[PDB]
Amino acid sequence: SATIALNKRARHEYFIEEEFEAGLALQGWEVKSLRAGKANISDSYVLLRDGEAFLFGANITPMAVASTHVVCDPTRTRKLLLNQRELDSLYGRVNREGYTVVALSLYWKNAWCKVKIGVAKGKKQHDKRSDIKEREWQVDKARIMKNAHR
Amino acid sequence: IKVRENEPFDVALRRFKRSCEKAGVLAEVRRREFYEKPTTERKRAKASAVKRHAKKLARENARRT
Amino acid sequence: RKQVSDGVAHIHASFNNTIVTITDRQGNALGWATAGGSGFRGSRKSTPFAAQVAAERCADAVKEYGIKNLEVMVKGPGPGRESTIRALNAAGFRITNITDVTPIPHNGCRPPKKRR
RNA sequence: GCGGCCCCCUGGACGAAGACUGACGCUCAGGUGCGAAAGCGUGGGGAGCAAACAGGAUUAGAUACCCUGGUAGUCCACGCCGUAAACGAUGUCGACUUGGAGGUUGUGCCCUUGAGGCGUGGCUUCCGGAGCUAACGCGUUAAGUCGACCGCCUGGGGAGUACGGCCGCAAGGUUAAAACUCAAAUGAAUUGACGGGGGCCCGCACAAGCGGUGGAGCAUGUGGUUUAAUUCGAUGCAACGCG
RNA sequence: GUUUAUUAAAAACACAGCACUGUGCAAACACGAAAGUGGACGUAUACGGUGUGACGCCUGCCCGGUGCCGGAAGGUUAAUUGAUGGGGUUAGCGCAAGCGAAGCUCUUGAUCGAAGCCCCGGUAAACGGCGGCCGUAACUAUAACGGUCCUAAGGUAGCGA
RNA sequence: UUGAGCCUUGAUGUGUAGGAUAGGUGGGAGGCUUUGAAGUGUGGACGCCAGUCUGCAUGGAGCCGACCUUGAAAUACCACCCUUUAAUGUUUGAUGUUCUAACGUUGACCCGUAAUCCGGGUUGCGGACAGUGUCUGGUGGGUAGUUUGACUGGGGCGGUC
RNA sequence: CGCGGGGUGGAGCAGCCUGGUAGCUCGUCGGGCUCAUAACCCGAAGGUCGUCGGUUCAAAUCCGGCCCCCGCAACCA
Structure with a gap:
């Protein structure tokens, strides 16, 4: 649909449990560049202090230049429009040394920027070998199973 | 391979279908000709086959069987 | 018929x-009914029970031709090859x-070299 | 390296008793020839298979494995390329040195005097004594004991590369370093460890059943936040009604 | 070698060679209203057209468009065929209008229908086409890289003021 | 062969009642039966498979119509024949094949004649195709005739009418 | 310009005709299903038939219209 660039590599590195559909506030040059205009999403995380959940890693540069006078930087900590129900609970289960909130995908909800955000947990590399083994383990298991019927 | 099994059989029991191979060349002609691995895999299997009869001569020990 | x-x-x-499928003595086919022709499209397409239904699905719908x-x-x-013959034994x-x-x-x- | 059968031409091996030549023997730098597959040139042919290539899936990504097509190639003939883990990784020849268990092909005698018995040769497999070895193993077709000759090796990397030579249509092939760097590289065996290596065992581990948490209220403890202080220690499993 | 007889002799043309495509003989093609000719008293190692240009290493990706080749189901589809529908005149009725037989006309267009195109595929030594954006490496820098926009593909080998 | 056209002919059609595969409209109460019946063995037809149509022979000589519940009524009998399937004959296209006889031969024989011209027949192979004429769709820079404005600080371009 | 038909559940297709007694599946939710989802299995839902009138015992059917989707040759102001 109206989906924008998504952090598919985050699923390999993190094993996110719960998701959100919080909206993102953005400037006037951001909206034009959001539909097309080369928005990137890699290494997207958050920098909460009180209620200041910011989409950190989001490289979106103005394709057609619409910047005059004051500065306009392509990478900014864009303010997220978060529900108060979803806000107080992030004083808890994100401060656990490995817990973070990342953005899996970017899209639209009837000409409004709503970003699918999720609370990542992060994989160490010792269990990264197991998951790649497990994905091959599921495929090869039915290969043995099908040989009974050949 | 081709048998009517007389008139009152009521069950196939066609052992001559499985007497020749029924799956031997029927799976040999499937894939992996490889031109030297059938040469290779008939070496060690026959090596195992002679060794199986060579280790069949391990009964000469007492073993308290 | x-x-x-x-x-x-x-x-x-x-x-x-x-x-x-069932053909005549000259080999002209009467009709075909396969395991994919009775559902089971995909994983369950290779099953003797699915071959059993396909043997039943071709046992009927040729009854106008009157074969015994x-x-x-x-x-x-x-x-x-080991179950449809049992189905044909029970088909009448x-x-x-x-x-x-x-x-x-x-x-x-x-032969090819696939399935490495 | 060579197998559907037939025919045509042709080499070698081994067995038997004799006849014959009378050391013509062995080996070999150079040299000469042959030499898998892929490849190159030319004229053909091309079912199937199939690099490359294209598409479909998988994955975070998969120009791979997988799936669907599919060219060169594979195939015939003429030449070229002289390269393979071209290896039983063990060069060629002669002689001597326990055996046992198999196969193949001879040939001689006795009883074919009943699917026979005993000899004597070639090729060859497996296991093994002596002996050798770093061990594994080798072991009368030795890696045992010697003799004849040739090729080759001299720490690892650089480097079979550089430059030069010749061969080659090209791809490349052969001949063959230096500077520089490292204090190791390596071979076998051993103890554990791991194995998406295999075989067996048991345990509420699963299955199988029955009761709960996680939803709700209050109770307790921890993290987080605040505070003047919200002492401090315990925080995979094996902390979190713990001290 | 050929060429602008008479301002340009060559970087042009030709060329050997390679490739594509067409042609099965009363061949394609060409001259020609037509006879008949050339091709050729030759017949696929042949002939016609086109592209390139000895030779050496080679010649990648792209069929959307155009062009060509193949396919036949369906859509549309000329001439013909004229079914139907309307009118004119009028034998007669209406002593008024109004109607209307038969005939002859004008008009209507169903039914019939291949090629063609639409459609389905193949074709680039068929014509031709072969891009971009920002982010990223422990000096700066730079992006091997990753994400993104569109296309049929996004210029390969090689070369380059 | 294949369809269409119509002749002949049976088949052919239970909203709901209701014993009914009763179509509509409609003339009708006696048709009819031993020129072998009710109703049999059933074949096949059949179908909303409700149950009729229903060959033959046994059976052997009666059955139904107004009559009855029905919106309606009775194929007791039919008329127009609708509907629906096939046979029948008939006019037609279309397709497949055979034949020779128009048509083709730049296959062969001889003849005019000594002449691959041409013509004569013989003969072979094709064969109602091919090809030609008329009509007609498609294609057609191969070819032909022409068009492509004015204003304008010259013109072009832009802009304007 | 007047010739060829069809319009019906949210969707795409039939019953209509040879009259009366509207369905199918796609999309839906209901369940099964399940280390987990799904494959797949069934449960349910929907328009009085494009609209308006007439004929008809009986109109979604048939006929009159009207409207819509088009298809068509026309197209010399």
Whole structure:
């Protein structure tokens, strides 16, 4: 649909449990560049202090230049429009040394920027070998199973 | 391979279908000709086959069987 | 429908599907009903029980031709070849002759190298 | 390296008793020839298979494995390329040195005097004594004991590369370093460890059943936040009604 | 070698060679209203057209468009065929209008229908086409890289002021 | 062969009642039966498979119509024949094949004649195609005739009418 | 310009005709299903038939219209 660039590599590195559909506030040059205009999403995380959940890693540069006078930087900590129900609970289960909130995908909800955000947990590399083994383990298991019927 | 099994059989029991191979060349002609691995895999299997009869001569020990 | 009491059962079994059809003595086909022709599209397409239904699905819908006896020809391996003959024994048709007509080449055509 | 059968031409091996030549023997730098597959040139042919290539899936990504097609190639003939883990990784020849268990092909005698018995040769497999070795193993077709000759090796990397030579249509092939760097590289065996290596065992581990948490209220403890202080220690399993 | 007889002799043309495509003989093609000719008293190692240009290493990706080749189901589809529908005149009725037989006309267009195109595929030594954006490496820098926009593909080998 | 056209002919059609595969409209109470019946063995037709149509022979000589519940009524009998399937004959296209006889021969024989011209027949192979004429769709820079404005600080371009 | 038909559940297709007694599946939810989802299995839902009138015992049917989707040759102001 109206989906924008998504952090598919985050699923390999993190094993996110719960998701959100919080909206993102953005400037006037951001909206034009959001539909097309080369928005990137890699290494997207958050920098909460009180209620200041910011989409950190989001490289979106103005394709057609619409910047005059004051500065306009392509990478900014864009303010997220978060529900108060979803806000107080992030004083808890994100401060656990490995817990973070990342953005899996970017899209639209009837000409409004709503970003699918999720609370990542992060994989160490010792269990990264197991998951790649497990994905091959599921495929090869039915290969043995099908040989009974050949 | 081709048998009517007389008139009152009521069950196939066609052992001559499985007497020749029924799956031997029927799976040999499937894939992996490889031109030297059938040469290779008939070496060690026959090596195992002679060794199986060579280790069949391990009964000469007492073993308290 | 020619009211042919005789019949010829051309059974072609593969490792993924069973081709079940009944032809005449001259080999002109009456109708075909396969395992993919009775549902089971995908994983369950190679099952002797799915070959059993396909043997039943071709046992009927040829009843206008009025067949009571057949000679069985089985080609290719698969989930069939050991259950459809039991289905044909229970279909009411006479099991006149069971002939294995799986084609054995004299290594003329080179097989591929797939499934590594 | 060579197998559907037939025919045509042709080499070698081994067995038997004799006849014959009378050391013509062995080996070999150079040199000469042959030499898998892929490849190159030319004229053909091309079912199937199939690099490359294209598409479909998988994955975070998969120009791979997988799936569907599919060219060169594979195939015939003429030449070229002289390269393979071209290896039983063990060069060629002669002689001597426990055996046992197999196969193949001879040939001689006795009883074919009943699917026979005993000899004597070639080729060859497996296991093994002596002996050798770093061990594994080798072991009368030795890696045992010697003799004849040739090729080759001299720490690892650089480097079979550089430059030069010749061969080659090209791809490349052969001949063959230096500077520089490292204090190791390596071979076998051993103890554990791991194995998406295999075989067996048991345990509430699963299955199988029955009761709960996680939803709700209050109770307790921890993290987080605040505070003047919200002492401090315990925080995979094996902390979190713990001290 | 050929060429602008008479301002340009060559970087042009030709060329050997390679490739594509067409042609089965009363061949394609060409001259020609037509006879008949050339091709050729030759017949696929042949002939016609086109592209390139000895030779050496080679010649990648792209069929959307155009062009060509193949396919036949369906859509549309000329001439013909004229079914139907309308009118004119009027034998007669209406002593008024109004109607209307038969005939002859004008008009209507169903039914019939291949090629063609639409459609389905193949074709680039068929014509031709072969891009971009920002982010990223422990000096700066730079992006091997990753994400993104569109296309049929996004210029390969090689070369380059 | 294949369809269409119509002749002949049976088949052919239970909203709901209701014993009914009763179509509509309609003339009708006696048709009819032993020129072998009710109703049999059933074949096949059949179908909303409700149950009729229903060959033959046994059976052997009666059955139904107004009559009855029905919106309606009775194929007791039919008329127009609708509907529906096939046979029948008939006019037609279309397709497949055979034949020779128009048509083709730049296959062969001889003849005019000594002449691959041409013509005569003989003969072979094709063969109602091919090809030609008229009509007609498609294609057609191969070819032909022409068009492509004015204003304008010259013109072009832009802009304007 | 006047010739060829069809319009019906949210969707795409039939019953209509040879009259009366509207369905199918796609999309839906209901369940099964399940280390987990799904494959797949069934449960349910929907327009009085494009609209308006007439004929008809009986109109979604048939006929009159009207409207819509088009298809068509026309197209010399």
